[PDB]
């Protein structure tokens, strides 16, 4: 309190001289981060992020955060890689339920689904940025057949961590474009297709288009996509 | 001379925390002939978290010179060549530090004590370390520095009255 308010560094040296014990000491003590913050103005395209940097959005301020700064994240926790998201990619029908979620967004079409088994990073994109955070409700579109996501965000207060964006440009890298953005409250990641390249692996569309259709929707899922379609579209135009 | 020479290059290691062979030191009769020579150069690990304000610090405190370091790029990693007095000149495109840089092989980041002093908020129980970080491309470094605060104020006040007995 009255000795740390008052000391400048520079007076500590001839200090730490009778005293290079506890140099050490005072140095790992100084790990409370009070920098490593500042502003992003929307819509915030991912190829203006900055290296290693979580986002976070909420009331508080839409804010980007150093890494080493960040404590909403968890340092044990160890988050799934853009390979780990091809490989989920790769099983997806043996996971159809895990990823109920992801296949609602394409409302019941089977030609945005054809789509998506030409273009493996819309499920790595999802699939990353789902790991991070559960509560997400993606919605697909196509346009000159080029599949297009757009992900919202259900609750306002949303932290997006470094490494899930680190991954989800490794995903997304030359042929699309990604962009936060937040519309009526809600926060909304946009991946743009921008060209169909072409995919080495080839996934059984069939079994996943007949296990699709065969899933019923219910009705919190219904009724909570239903209020959420609406918003993407008022922010599409 | 030698002695003062030798006391900086074994505070840089211990600083630091660099070991034997990721130091290098330049004789400081070839020194003393030139002003523009660096008397180490400091190889600097990424993701790594670096206590480069007092070692600036510690270098003012036994120095009646105002420190100069300088980041580095070479290429596959990054280095921080120390010098006493600043360089008469410098590599071209030289900048002082922010609290987040692009660092290219070509460029070279200029950090002293009164830049540091622009970026951390007060100045008494405030400590600011840098970090280096590799970047999206395969050339391309980040330094970054960011200041910091202790974990607990007691455990600080303590220590600063355990420093005056
Ligand atoms: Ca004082
Ligand atoms: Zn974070």
């Given at each position: 309190?009255?000795?740390?308010?008052?000391?400048?560094?520079?007076?500590?040296?001839?200090?730490?001289?009778?005293?290079?014990?506890?140099?050490?000491?005072?140095?790992?003590?100084?790990?409370?981060?009070?920098?490593?913050?500042?502003?992003?103005?929307?819509?915030?395209?991912?190829?203006?992020?900055?290296?290693?940097?979580?986002?976070?959005?909420?009331?508080?301020?839409?804010?980007?955060?150093?890494?080493?700064?960040?404590?909403?994240?968890?340092?044990?926790?160890?988050?799934?890689?853009?390979?780990?998201?091809?490989?989920?990619?790769?099983?997806?029908?043996?996971?159809?339920?895990?990823?109920?979620?992801?296949?609602?967004?394409?409302?019941?079409?089977?030609?945005?689904?054809?789509?998506?088994?030409?273009?493996?990073?819309?499920?790595?994109?999802?699939?990353?940025?789902?790991?991070?955070?559960?509560?997400?409700?993606?919605?697909?579109?196509?346009?000159?057949?080029?599949?297009?996501?757009?992900?919202?965000?259900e609750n306002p207060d949303v932290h997006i961590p470094?490494?899930?964006?680190?991954?989800?440009?490794?995903?997304?890298?030359?042929?699309?474009?990604?962009?936060?953005?937040?519309?009526?409250?809600?926060?909304?990641?946009?991946?743009?297709?921008?060209?169909?390249?072409?995919?080495?692996?080839?996934?059984?569309?069939?079994?996943?288009?007949?296990?699709?259709?065969?899933?019923?929707?219910?009705?919190?899922?219904?009724?909570?996509?239903?209020?959420?379609?609406?918003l993407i579209q008022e922010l599409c135009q | 001379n030698?002695?003062?020479?030798?006391?900086?290059?074994?505070?840089?290691?211990?600083?630091?925390?660099?070991?034997?062979?990721?130091?290098?030191?330049?004789?400081?009769?070839?020194?003393?002939?030139?002003?523009?020579?660096?008397?180490?150069?400091?190889?600097?690990?990424?993701?790594?978290?670096?206590?480069?304000?007092?070692?600036?610090?510690?270098?003012?405190?036994?120095?009646?010179?105002?420190?100069?370091?300088?980041?580095?790029?070479?290429?596959?990693?990054?280095?921080?060549?120390?010098?006493?007095?600043?360089?008469v000149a410098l590599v071209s495109p030289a900048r002082?530090?922010?609290?987040?840089?692009?660092?290219?092989?070509?460029?070279?980041?200029?950090?002293?004590?009164?830049?540091?002093?622009?970026?951390?908020?007060?100045?008494?129980?405030?400590?600011?370390?840098?970090?280096?970080?590799?970047?999206?491309?395969?050339?391309?470094?980040?330094?970054?520095?960011?200041?910091?605060?202790?974990?607990?104020?007691?455990?600080?006040?303590?220590?600063?009255?355990?420093?005056?007995?």
């Open positions: 309190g009255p000795l740390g308010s008052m000391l400048k560094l520079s007076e500590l040296h001839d200090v730490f001289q009778r005293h290079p014990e506890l140099e050490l000491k005072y140095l790992n003590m100084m790990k409370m981060a009070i920098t490593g913050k500042e502003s992003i103005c929307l819509p915030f395209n991912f190829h203006s992020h900055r290296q290693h940097t979580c986002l976070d959005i909420s009331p508080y301020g839409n804010e980007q955060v150093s890494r080493i700064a960040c404590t909403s994240c968890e340092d044990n926790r160890i988050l799934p890689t853009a390979s780990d998201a091809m490989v989920a990619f790769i099983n997806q029908t043996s996971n159809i339920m895990k990823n109920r979620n992801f296949y609602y967004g394409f409302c019941k079409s089977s030609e945005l689904l054809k789509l998506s088994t030409n273009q493996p990073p819309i499920f790595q994109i999802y699939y990353l940025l789902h790991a991070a955070n559960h509560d997400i409700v993606p919605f697909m579109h196509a346009e000159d057949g080029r599949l297009h996501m757009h992900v919202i965000f470094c490494d899930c964006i680190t991954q989800m440009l490794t995903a997304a890298r030359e042929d699309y474009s990604v962009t936060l953005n937040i519309v009526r409250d809600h926060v909304v990641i946009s991946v743009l297709c921008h060209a169909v390249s072409a995919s080495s692996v080839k996934i059984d569309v069939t079994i996943l288009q007949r296990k699709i259709d065969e899933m019923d929707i219910p009705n919190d899922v219904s009724e909570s996509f239903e209020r959420y379609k609406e | 030698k002695v003062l020479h030798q006391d900086l290059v074994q505070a840089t290691r211990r600083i630091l925390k660099l070991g034997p062979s990721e130091l290098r030191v330049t004789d400081a009769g070839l020194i003393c002939k030139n002003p523009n020579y660096s008397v180490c150069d400091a190889m600097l690990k990424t993701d790594t978290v670096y206590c480069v304000e007092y070692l600036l610090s510690y270098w003012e405190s036994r120095a009646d010179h105002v420190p100069c370091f300088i980041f580095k790029n070479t290429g596959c990693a990054v280095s921080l060549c120390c010098f006493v007095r600043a360089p002082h530090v922010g609290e987040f840089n692009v660092l290219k092989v070509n460029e070279s980041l200029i950090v002293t004590l009164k830049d540091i002093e622009e970026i951390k908020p007060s100045a008494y129980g405030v400590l600011t370390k840098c970090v280096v970080r590799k970047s999206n491309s395969a050339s391309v470094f980040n330094i970054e520095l960011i200041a910091f605060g202790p974990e607990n104020e007691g455990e600080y006040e303590n220590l600063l009255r355990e420093l005056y007995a």
